[PDB]
Design a protein around this ligand. Structure first.
Ligand SMILES: *[C@@H]1O[C@H](CO)[C@@H](O[C@@H]2O[C@H](CO)[C@@H](O[C@@H]3O[C@H](CO[C@H]4O[C@H](CO)[C@@H](O)[C@H](O)[C@@H]4O)[C@@H](O)[C@H](O[C@H]4O[C@H](CO)[C@@H](O)[C@H](O)[C@@H]4O)[C@@H]3O)[C@H](O)[C@H]2NC(C)=O)[C@H](O)[C@H]1NC(C)=O
Ligand SMILES: *[C@@H]1O[C@H](CO)[C@@H](O[C@@H]2O[C@H](CO)[C@@H](O[C@@H]3O[C@H](CO)[C@@H](O)[C@H](O)[C@@H]3O)[C@H](O)[C@H]2NC(C)=O)[C@H](O)[C@H]1NC(C)=O
Ligand SMILES: *[C@@H]1O[C@H](CO)[C@@H](O[C@@H]2O[C@H](CO)[C@@H](O[C@@H]3O[C@H](CO)[C@@H](O)[C@H](O)[C@@H]3O)[C@H](O)[C@H]2NC(C)=O)[C@H](O)[C@H]1NC(C)=O
Ligand SMILES: *[C@@H]1O[C@H](CO)[C@@H](O[C@@H]2O[C@H](CO)[C@@H](O)[C@H](O)[C@H]2NC(C)=O)[C@H](O)[C@H]1NC(C)=O
Ligand SMILES: *[C@@H]1O[C@H](CO)[C@@H](O[C@@H]2O[C@H](CO)[C@@H](O)[C@H](O)[C@H]2NC(C)=O)[C@H](O)[C@H]1NC(C)=O
Ligand SMILES: *[C@@H]1O[C@H](CO)[C@@H](O[C@@H]2O[C@H](CO)[C@@H](O)[C@H](O)[C@H]2NC(C)=O)[C@H](O)[C@H]1NC(C)=O
Ligand SMILES: *[C@@H]1O[C@H](CO)[C@@H](O[C@@H]2O[C@H](CO)[C@@H](O)[C@H](O)[C@H]2NC(C)=O)[C@H](O)[C@H]1NC(C)=O
Ligand SMILES: *[C@@H]1O[C@H](CO)[C@@H](O)[C@H](O)[C@H]1NC(C)=O
Ligand SMILES: *[C@@H]1O[C@H](CO)[C@@H](O)[C@H](O)[C@H]1NC(C)=O
Ligand SMILES: *[C@@H]1O[C@H](CO)[C@@H](O)[C@H](O)[C@H]1NC(C)=O
Ligand SMILES: *[C@@H]1O[C@H](CO)[C@@H](O)[C@H](O)[C@H]1NC(C)=O
Ligand SMILES: *[C@@H]1O[C@H](CO)[C@@H](O)[C@H](O)[C@H]1NC(C)=O
Ligand SMILES: *[C@@H]1O[C@H](CO)[C@@H](O)[C@H](O)[C@H]1NC(C)=O
Ligand SMILES: *[C@@H]1O[C@H](CO)[C@@H](O)[C@H](O)[C@H]1NC(C)=O
Ligand SMILES: *[C@@H]1O[C@H](CO)[C@@H](O)[C@H](O)[C@H]1NC(C)=O
Ligand SMILES: *[C@@H]1O[C@H](CO)[C@@H](O)[C@H](O)[C@H]1NC(C)=O
Ligand SMILES: *[C@@H]1O[C@H](CO)[C@@H](O)[C@H](O)[C@H]1NC(C)=O
Ligand SMILES: *[C@@H]1O[C@H](CO)[C@@H](O)[C@H](O)[C@H]1NC(C)=O
Ligand SMILES: *[C@@H]1O[C@H](CO)[C@@H](O)[C@H](O)[C@H]1NC(C)=O
Ligand SMILES: *[C@@H]1O[C@H](CO)[C@@H](O)[C@H](O)[C@H]1NC(C)=O
Ligand SMILES: *[C@@H]1O[C@H](CO)[C@@H](O)[C@H](O)[C@H]1NC(C)=O
Ligand SMILES: *[C@@H]1O[C@H](CO)[C@@H](O)[C@H](O)[C@H]1NC(C)=O
Lengths: 236, 123, 439, 123, 122, 49
């Protein structure tokens, strides 16, 4: 299980520095990394950075190298395997161009090749290079395949690809990770495939609730999530 | 090399690579009625663990594979969600609902495997 | 995708449990009452292994090591008391007087000169002899006739004069297949999940100091001062306070007493209090006043964390009961001291030179669990003086607030030390699915 | 599934198919100077049975075949006259005259088999 | 067949051919203090089987390993050992590095088990 | 049948004055004496004139 609650939706004019809290429950707060990802209106989803609430070792994107500050405090053990923690994040040279919805997401695993991958997302707070399929659609019973590709700086076995379902302005949900493995609870109708130049997401036997947008992430073991443009699915 | 019970909070796969370090401190160390009663009690638990080890056909081996399959009603989680994701303590805590059934199935599977081998060796 | 079960022998999974724990003491060789010669002598390196990512639930008030240690201590007292000479012939009529007691007319009864008839090595002969008895060990009959306190209630036996009642460190250990969980959190409340847990095979050196209202020679808190109780809101549960800066106490009996060996029976020689060389003074304990005031302040600052910053609490003496409960009772140099503590808890604290305590001496002490067995402490020659560290308190709430000390149960003193330790068992067998199949 | 010692009066072959049910109740159950003396004695009989099991080369297996032949002077009866004809009680009653000799021969046969394997593994 | 401890002064190879005769007299025979010795004796036998099992020699009196022979332990030759010394003087000379050898056997069997578990996944 | 097995080619160092069987037997004999003496009648009344 596990649940993450975010701060309030307050607004502030440019030049300031705001802090956003993220309180965790239902899991060992020390066992997984924490990621901050911002969804901007005039841009794609951008991975800002992750920290380890166990080692304290941080790693951000170069675009947020000298402008963002992320901290955590010690956990409060609830049981042998449940803990409650918090996480704070601020931006120093803050303007009005960084407006959007911010999400804090715990890591995927505590070992392997997909450790820090943002898996369990929050509620979202309201503030003040990888191209995929333009638009595809289908009908109940058939299958669809969404593409995703980019340059050698973001393609190929060199990197790993994940697939995310994202309702507009709501809680996202992970579908695929490391190019074929699907998240727990995902129906077997979803399939992931990967060529040397593109990744495919196959969805057979569609159903009405699938009217949603989809994104793909390019990521290695010690890098950030490189999101895509977006694929708008229609009908129902 | 972390020592005895070093990988208590570690992932299950990490602790699986150091099994001798826990196996060599089960009957030895430094171990008047109280003192002798615990030794007799301790040796019964080792033989309790070794008797079950032999009845499943894993005599003298720390990693043994079986013929029984995995039942989804016990636990739906995946392999990468177990070995690199959970510790042995919480695993034993969660799976503590069906251990007796699994033990019985292992017993009967090894028994039928022995019967099949006895049938096959008659040519 | 057909996953198969795989067995692993030696998986790090434990379960909380209760098991018999044995005793180990560092080597020192006479023989003490604790029979530490019967424990294993050599500790090479108590190897502690920090268990990272391991947060385990501890509960000192449901701990089982404490009950085992309680029964073991009772067993050690009775084992040391078993082979010594019985004192059933000592329950007779006594003729007692104030010998030079009438000086100031204050402490006349405190110590008394008693003559009486007693058996000798021959069955048919008797001998009339004298001795010195403290007031706390005799009761009148009514003339100057007296009788021992234990006669109407119990049988009496004296301790053999070679065993020492001075406590020595005890390291409690678990057998093979079991381990002790030590919680190293410096702000550990005593209950709940501990984030930093380590494992050991044996505890540190623990001294069995039997004390009351003041914990003597105990462990020190690393930071602040820690307050523990089962139900802090319940006044029927005693409050255990642990200090970080120890307060030194100086206890002394300056009466230069002397022993007189008197033969009661075949192979049995009793040790009476012969005479007092020099002045007859009062046994007492000192503590520095300023250090006590500072430690009381740091105790109340943490007491305010569970009752409010504005509520005013005060300290008073004990409310009543048995002698061993209403006083600071302990064993110094061999003899049993009971010190009045009204001069310690006599301060009221508002929102925002050395002192001395009079002590009386007993040598007839009964067991705190079963009444029906009494031990005579043989008197100790010379002047008695012991310096100790008060490090903990046993307070009782009443229900503004007033606090009165106490605690007559022996197991409180062990709870004061075994809060860090928790005994667990190991089930080293673990089954898990893998993509491997036999054959 | 008849339980512990269920096939006492059954044919030997019928009891041979349920061997785990008797093997799992030799050192466990619910088992005090008298009480502790029996536990120490009971584990000695299990190790008495397991030590002989290991010295014959049947470590951790309930059905093992050997290299020694069957002597007719021990018993002249036939296979269908044993497995489908008698219970283990009357069989152990009849064969209780030469068990020690068979045990010694099993010991020496396993020893020579180990020596042969050591000789063969030198190439 | 010389009996129990018959080949005490014999060469090591001569004693190696009769191993059952010493192995069958380690927990049997005729065996308050006396019961303490039996409970102690079985712990040493299981101490011997625990080390036997942790090296991968479960139920076998002669087992070969994967670790090599270090010359710093002893420079002598094979014909300078088997037809040349008794087990007493050998254990006397090599009693300087037995613990190291035991640890290497432990770790070699552990890695061998890991290699077999890795290999069985195809 | 006390089965003695001659150990040929075996020259072993003995030391009777540091032997441990002797001290153990001393304590065993003392323990047996006191065990036999424990349940018998005491003679404390016999110490008279
Ligand atoms: C207690 O719980 C914590 C939290 O779960 C555990 O900490 C995790 O430890 C595992 C490994 O034990 C970590 O996963 C591994 O990370 C390695 C490197 O990540 C670091 O990378 C840079 C390099 O300096 C640091 O800046 C950064 O902050 C990270 O700390 C990877 O190398 C591992 O393998 C991956 O990379 C290698 C590269 O060669 C590949 O070969 C592999 O295939 C794979 O792709 C692995 O991913 C995990 O990140 C830690 N989590 C946290 C939150 O810190 C403790 O281990 C645990 N304690 C115990 C005793 O179990
Ligand atoms: C406790 O009471 C006993 C009496 O039962 C005291 O013993 C007696 O003490 C007196 C006074 O010291 C002794 O008298 C003295 O005798 C000596 C020697 O003959 C003589 O030189 C003195 O002039 C004086 O008369 C008496 O003998 C003695 N009797 C016995 C049996 O000891 C005892 O002193 C008292 N104890 C204390 C601490 O006061
Ligand atoms: C708390 O611990 C301290 C020390 O750890 C204890 O003080 C010790 O008290 C005993 C007896 O009161 C002293 O023993 C005596 O030592 C002198 C030294 O010359 C010796 O001559 C005597 O025959 C006797 O053995 C001991 O020295 C003393 N230790 C120190 C360091 O002063 C104290 O008693 C303990 N508190 C309690 C309540 O037990
Ligand atoms: C990120 O912000 C936090 C505030 O939440 C900073 O932490 C404090 O910084 C000040 C100024 O350097 C120190 O005086 C404090 O001791 C810090 N800790 C606390 C608890 O206040 C933190 O320094 C910021 N990060 C960076 C890189 O400057
Ligand atoms: C009384 O407390 C003091 C201070 O805690 C003790 O002195 C310490 O003793 C330990 C162990 O002997 C040493 O490791 C420390 O370095 C000492 N510190 C100081 C400041 O003295 C003293 O031993 C205690 N006395 C008794 C009788 O418990
Ligand atoms: C207590 O009284 C005893 C005598 O009962 C004193 O013992 C004497 O001590 C001195 C020390 O120099 C010796 O020379 C004497 O021989 C001792 N007398 C006996 C009879 O043994 C002891 O000194 C006194 N102690 C105190 C503190 O007053
Ligand atoms: C209790 O007694 C001890 C020693 O008998 C006193 O400690 C001594 O204090 C003086 C200070 O004048 C120091 O010079 C000594 O070194 C101390 N002795 C030791 C062994 O440390 C202590 O002050 C007394 N306390 C009270 C309250 O009387
Ligand atoms: C799983 O277990 C249930 C009950 O224990 C049983 O009815 C079912 O047949 C099992 N399924 C498999 C695949 O073993
Ligand atoms: C294991 O993975 C699941 C995936 O949902 C996650 O909820 C859980 O926190 C992870 N860790 C443990 C110890 O279960
Ligand atoms: C175990 O079974 C009990 C009773 O059926 C149930 O309440 C509990 O949730 C189960 N736990 C697990 C981990 O299956
Ligand atoms: C001792 O003195 C007290 C002083 O009041 C007196 O009451 C008591 O009777 C005296 N005891 C005697 C003289 O035995
Ligand atoms: C001892 O016995 C005699 C008997 O004549 C008695 O007079 C005397 O008072 C007794 N001693 C004491 C101290 O009472
Ligand atoms: C023994 O005497 C004391 C003296 O007051 C008294 O308190 C106690 O109750 C008596 N015991 C019995 C059993 O009468
Ligand atoms: C002790 O502290 C723990 C820490 O959370 C708390 O849960 C518990 O209620 C406290 N107990 C008391 C009696 O204050
Ligand atoms: C503590 O005591 C009070 C009254 O004495 C009681 O109401 C309360 O329930 C107790 N606490 C617990 C946890 O039971
Ligand atoms: C009491 O004072 C402390 C200062 O240490 C403060 O943290 C706490 O909030 C205060 N509590 C109340 C109820 O005023
Ligand atoms: C202790 O002393 C106080 C005054 O210092 C006094 O009121 C009290 O009665 C004394 N207690 C005893 C038991 O003598
Ligand atoms: C107790 O305190 C009161 C008031 O401060 C004082 O009058 C009295 O003398 C004190 N008594 C003791 C024994 O400290
Ligand atoms: C049968 O046993 C006898 C004596 O035990 C022996 O002489 C004979 O050779 C054996 N024959 C077979 C076939 O085992
Ligand atoms: C076994 O020996 C007994 C007497 O020793 C004899 O009565 C019986 O017939 C023998 N049975 C067999 C099968 O040899
Ligand atoms: C022999 O042992 C030494 C020290 O133990 C070690 O450095 C060396 O590598 C070893 N050589 C071989 C061949 O094992
Ligand atoms: C073994 O070690 C001891 C002490 O270090 C030394 O005297 C002896 O020569 C060594 N023997 C061998 C064979 O290395």
């Amino acid at each position: 299980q596990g649940q993450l609650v975010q701060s309030g939706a307050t607004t502030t004019k440019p030049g300031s520095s705001v802090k956003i809290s993220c309180k965790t429950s239902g899991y060992r707060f020390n066992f997984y990394h924490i990621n901050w990802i911002r969804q901007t209106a005039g841009r794609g989803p951008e991975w800002m950075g992750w920290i380890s609430p166990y080692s304290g070792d941080k790693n951000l994107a170069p675009a947020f190298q000298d402008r963002v500050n992320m901290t955590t405090d010690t956990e409060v053990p609830v049981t042998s395997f449940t803990s409650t923690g918090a996480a704070y994040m601020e931006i120093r040279n803050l303007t009005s161009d960084d407006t959007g919805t911010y999400f804090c997401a715990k890591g995927l695993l505590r070992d392997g090749s997909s450790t820090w991958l943002p898996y369990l997302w929050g509620q979202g707070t309201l503030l003040t290079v990888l191209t995929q399929s333009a638009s595809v659609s289908g009908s109940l019973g058939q299958s669809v395949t969404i593409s995703c590709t980019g340059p050698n700086s973001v393609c190929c076995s060199h990197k790993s690809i994940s697939w995310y379902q994202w309702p507009p302005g709501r809680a996202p949900t992970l579908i695929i990770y490391e190019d074929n493995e699907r998240a727990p609870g995902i129906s077997p109708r979803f399939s992931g495939y990967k060529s040397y130049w593109s990744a495919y997401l196959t969805i057979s036997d569609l159903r009405p609730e699938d009217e949603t947008t989809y994104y793909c992430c390019s990521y290695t073991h010690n890098s950030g999530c490189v999101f895509g443009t977006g694929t708008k699915v229609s009908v129902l | 090399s972390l020592g005895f019970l070093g990988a208590a909070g570690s992932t299950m796969g990490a602790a699986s690579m150091t099994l001798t370090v826990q196996a060599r401190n089960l009957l030895s160390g430094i171990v008047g009625i109280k003192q002798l009663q615990a030794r007799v009690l301790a040796v019964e638990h080792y033989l309790r663990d070794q008797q079950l080890l032999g009845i499943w056909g894993c005599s003298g081996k720390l990693i043994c594979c079986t013929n029984v399959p995995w039942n989804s009603s016990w636990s739906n989680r995946n392999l990468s969600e177990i070995w690199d994701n959970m510790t042995w303590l919480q695993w034993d805590k969660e799976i503590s609902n069906y251990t007796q059934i699994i033990y019985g199935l292992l017993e009967e599977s090894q028994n039928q495997q022995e019967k099949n081998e006895q049938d096959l060796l008659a040519l | 995708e057909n996953l198969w079960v795989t067995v692993y022998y030696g998986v790090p999974v434990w379960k909380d449990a209760e098991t018999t724990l044995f005793c180990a003491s560092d080597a020192k060789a006479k023989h003490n009452v604790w029979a530490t010669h019967a424990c294993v002598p050599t500790d090479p390196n108590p190897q502690e292994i920090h268990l990272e990512n391991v947060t385990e639930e501890f509960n000192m008030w449901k701990n089982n090591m404490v009950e085992q240690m309680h029964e073991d201590i009772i067993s050690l007292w009775d084992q040391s008391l078993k082979p010594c000479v019985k004192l059933t012939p000592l329950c007779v009529t006594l003729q007692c007087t104030n010998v030079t007691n009438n000086i100031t007319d204050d402490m006349r009864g405190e110590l008394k000169n008693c003559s009486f008839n007693m058996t000798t090595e021959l069955r048919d002969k008797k001998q009339k002899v004298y001795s010195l008895f403290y007031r706390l060990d005799v009761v009148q009959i009514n003339n100057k006739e007296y009788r021992l306190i234990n006669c109407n209630t119990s049988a009496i036996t004296q301790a053999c004069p070679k065993v020492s009642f001075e406590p020595i460190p005890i390291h409690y250990c678990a057998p093979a297949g079991f381990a002790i969980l030590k919680c190293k959190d410096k702000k550990f409340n005593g209950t709940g999940p501990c984030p930093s847990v380590s494992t050991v095979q044996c505890t540190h050196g623990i001294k069995p100091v039997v004390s009351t209202q003041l914990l003597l020679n105990g462990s020190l808190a690393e930071e602040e001062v820690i307050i523990r109780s089962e139900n802090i809101t319940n006044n029927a549960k005693n409050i255990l306070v642990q200090l970080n800066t120890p307060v030194q106490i100086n206890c002394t009996r300056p009466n230069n007493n002397t022993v007189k060996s008197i033969r009661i029976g075949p192979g049995q020689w009793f040790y009476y209090t012969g005479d007092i060389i020099g002045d007859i003074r009062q046994a007492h304990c000192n503590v520095s006043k300023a250090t006590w005031n500072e430690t009381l302040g740091k105790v109340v600052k943490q007491l305010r964390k569970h009752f409010g910053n504005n509520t005013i609490i005060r300290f008073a003496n004990s409310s009543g009961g048995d002698l061993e409960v209403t006083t600071h009772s302990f064993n110094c140099g061999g003899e049993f001291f009971y010190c009045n503590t009204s001069g310690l808890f006599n301060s009221t604290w508002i929102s925002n030179d050395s002192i001395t305590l009079p002590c009386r001496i007993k040598q007839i002490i009964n067991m705190w669990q079963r009444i029906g067995q009494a031990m005579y402490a043989p008197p100790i020659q010379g002047v008695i003086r012991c310096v100790s560290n008060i490090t903990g308190l046993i307070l009782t709430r009443d229900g503004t607030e007033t606090f009165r000390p106490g605690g007559g149960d022996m197991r409180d003193n062990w709870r004061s030390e075994l809060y860090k330790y928790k005994v667990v068992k190991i089930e080293p067998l673990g089954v898990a699915p893998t993509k491997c199949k036999r054959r």
